[PDB]
Scaffold this active site. Structure first.
Site, PDB file in Angstrom:
ATOM      1  N   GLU A 189      -9.825 -42.478  68.535  1.00  0.00           N
ATOM      2  CA  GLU A 189     -10.014 -41.063  68.264  1.00  0.00           C
ATOM      3  C   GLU A 189     -10.285 -40.702  66.820  1.00  0.00           C
ATOM      4  OE1 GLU A 189      -9.218 -39.710  72.307  1.00  0.00           O
ATOM      5  OE2 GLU A 189     -10.119 -38.746  70.504  1.00  0.00           O
ATOM      6  N   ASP A 236     -15.443 -32.290  69.757  1.00  0.00           N
ATOM      7  CA  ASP A 236     -15.350 -33.640  70.298  1.00  0.00           C
ATOM      8  C   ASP A 236     -16.675 -34.093  70.901  1.00  0.00           C
ATOM      9  OD1 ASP A 236     -13.347 -33.194  73.367  1.00  0.00           O
ATOM     10  OD2 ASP A 236     -15.320 -32.541  72.787  1.00  0.00           O
ATOM     11  N   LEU A 283      -7.142 -31.874  71.804  1.00  0.00           N
ATOM     12  CA  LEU A 283      -8.015 -30.811  72.300  1.00  0.00           C
ATOM     13  C   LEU A 283      -7.400 -29.456  72.109  1.00  0.00           C
ATOM     14  CD1 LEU A 283     -10.539 -29.951  73.954  1.00  0.00           C
ATOM     15  CD2 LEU A 283      -9.120 -29.863  75.875  1.00  0.00           C
ATOM     16  N   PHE A 317      -4.933 -40.010  78.180  1.00  0.00           N
ATOM     17  CA  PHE A 317      -5.023 -39.184  76.968  1.00  0.00           C
ATOM     18  C   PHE A 317      -6.421 -38.607  76.824  1.00  0.00           C
ATOM     19  CE2 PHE A 317      -3.228 -38.522  72.634  1.00  0.00           C
ATOM     20  CZ  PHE A 317      -4.367 -38.284  71.872  1.00  0.00           C
ATOM     21  N   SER A 321     -10.596 -47.767  91.720  1.00  0.00           N
ATOM     22  CA  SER A 321     -10.266 -48.630  90.583  1.00  0.00           C
ATOM     23  C   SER A 321      -8.750 -48.844  90.493  1.00  0.00           C
ATOM     24  CB  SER A 321     -10.680 -47.930  89.301  1.00  0.00           C
ATOM     25  OG  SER A 321     -12.081 -47.795  89.203  1.00  0.00           O
ATOM     26  N   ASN A 366     -15.864 -51.695  88.806  1.00  0.00           N
ATOM     27  CA  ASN A 366     -15.760 -50.361  89.383  1.00  0.00           C
ATOM     28  C   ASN A 366     -15.536 -49.277  88.311  1.00  0.00           C
ATOM     29  OD1 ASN A 366     -13.822 -48.101  90.951  1.00  0.00           O
ATOM     30  ND2 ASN A 366     -15.409 -48.996  92.234  1.00  0.00           N
TER      31      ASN A 366
END
Ligand SMILES: [Cl-]
Ligand SMILES: [Cl-]
Length: 162
Positions: free
Chosen positions: A11, A20, A32, A104, A117, A132
């Protein structure tokens, strides 16, 4: 390597409001603020999150504090989610980190949707799950980060981050 260091690499750290990859207002270590297109609305969410009139700029300490809260919430969301919990419980420490990273980034709801998955990870079919996981908007939109997370689930090591 640990979850904190992992996410700090993915990040980065910015002390002024930024947009972002999806164009949403964010700050710090991937925190965010709002999906709204308004800077004011973002500034207001920021002030409420920090507890002071910030003017869109925070200190490093403030960024790390939001970061600690956000990682804690991600873990807690996993543990409270019926689809995620069992997966997380079944995994080793390194792979757990990769699941937290995905939560996250995309939220619990988002990750919970990778039904197939998840089932593959629970069964420990590493290569199959990696394939996948790659068939997703997530991989197509942020491929390098997705690849790092996928390699982690595939190998169970931190190699992608070293
Ligand atoms: Cl908050
Ligand atoms: Cl990326």
């Amino acid at each position: 390597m640990n979850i904190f260091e992992m996410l700090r690499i993915d990040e980065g750290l910015r002390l002024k409001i930024y947009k972002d990859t999806e164009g949403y207002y964010t700050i710090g270590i991937g925190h965010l603020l709002t999906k709204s297109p308004s800077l004011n609305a973002a500034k207001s969410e920021l002030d409420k999150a920090i507890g002071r009139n910030t003017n869109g700029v925070i200190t490093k300490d403030e960024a790390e504090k939001l970061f600690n809260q956000d990682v804690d919430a991600a873990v807690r969301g996993i543990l409270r989610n019926a689809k995620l919990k069992p997966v997380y419980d079944s995994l080793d420490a390194v792979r757990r980190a990769a699941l937290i990273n995905m939560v996250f980034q995309m939220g619990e709801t988002g990750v919970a949707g990778f039904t197939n998955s998840l089932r593959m990870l629970q069964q420990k079919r590493w290569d199959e799950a990696a394939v996948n996981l790659a068939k997703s908007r997530w991989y197509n939109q942020t491929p390098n980060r997705a690849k790092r997370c996928i390699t982690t689930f595939r190998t169970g090591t931190w190699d992608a981050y070293k």
